[PDB]
Design a protein around this ligand. Structure first.
Ligand SMILES: NS(=O)(=O)c1ccc(NC(=O)CN2C(=O)NC3(CCCCCC3)C2=O)cc1
Ligand SMILES: [Zn+2]
Length: 258
């Protein structure tokens, strides 16, 4: 596939190779804070990252992924809307060319500067490849980024980006603690949706935190120096790697909080 975020290969083209792009539970969506309803049936959200084992950072030509050892139950997400145990396998971000855009989800049509996706797969399906074939296969924890004060726990990510500037470059990224990327509050919205990149599989329980994290202008400027292209190819800055809001269709967004 040759999908990306340009005029010629961007989100409006994706449906030709990935017809589910026009499906019934696509992501991201706008979160209308007034029509999202408090659900008392939601159990407490459990983010258990104490034993998280990061291994590597990869520039995959669409974003950069911090990859985890998911060979055991070391870093898991449970509770909230979730049945059973979801294992952390990677995180990445989507971000803008300028501070006024970059998030995939929106909140009353507001766009944040960036959005962090912590990707977990349901352990009842045994591996990630099997889990993406199921409607409850994945849980993605989405966290908004606004530009303000630096996020101390982000800086180790920022400082390695120089070593993975281009598509296909990776670097060792051991002993990174993803708990440093969380906000104080775990208040969330949740809805059923999809991967936000091809293959756009309708396999995700979305859990979007209400409280954004603050990152510095200097931190997000370093995200924007990455390249979509490979080494020795024409430089295309890795910016505006976000899919816009998709139709909500027959879905309800539920709030964990009143
Ligand atoms: N924007 S999104 O909705 O959160 C979204 C979330 C996940 C995906 N897709 C994947 O994670 C597919 N995939 C990678 O890219 N890396 C792998 C994980 C790292 C461990 C080694 C296996 C490879 C993997 O399984 C696409 C969109
Ligand atoms: Zn994502």
């Amino acid at each position: 596939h040759h999908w990306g975020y340009g005029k010629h290969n961007g989100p409006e083209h994706w449906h030709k190779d990935f017809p589910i792009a026009k499906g019934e539970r696509q992501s991201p969506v706008d979160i209308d804070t007034h029509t999202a309803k408090y659900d008392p049936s939601l159990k407490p959200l459990s983010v258990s990252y104490d034993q998280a084992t990061s291994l590597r950072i990869l520039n995959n030509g669409h974003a950069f992924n911090v990859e985890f050892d998911d060979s055991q139950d070391k870093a898991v997400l449970k509770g909230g809307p979730l049945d059973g145990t979801y294992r952390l396998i990677q995180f990445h971000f989507h971000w803008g060319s300028l501070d006024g855009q970059g998030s995939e989800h929106t909140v009353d049509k507001k766009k944040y500067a960036a959005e962090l996706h912590l990707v977990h797969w349901n352990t009842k399906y045994g591996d990630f490849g099997k889990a993406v074939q199921q409607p409850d296969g994945l849980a993605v924890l989405g966290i908004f980024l606004k530009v303000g004060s630096a996020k101390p726990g982000l800086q180790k990510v920022v400082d390695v980006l120089d070593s993975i500037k281009t598509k296909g470059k990776s670097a060792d990224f051991t002993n990174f603690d993803p708990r440093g990327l969380l906000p104080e509050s775990l208040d969330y919205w949740t809805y059923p949706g999809s991967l936000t990149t091809p293959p756009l599989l309708e396999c995700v329980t979305w859990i979007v935190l209400k409280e954004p994290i603050s990152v510095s202008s200097e931190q997000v400027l370093k995200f924007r120096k990455l390249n979509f292209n490979g080494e020795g190819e024409p430089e295309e800055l890795m910016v505006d790697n976000w899919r816009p809001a998709q139709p909500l269709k027959n879905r309800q967004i539920k709030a964990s909080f009143k």
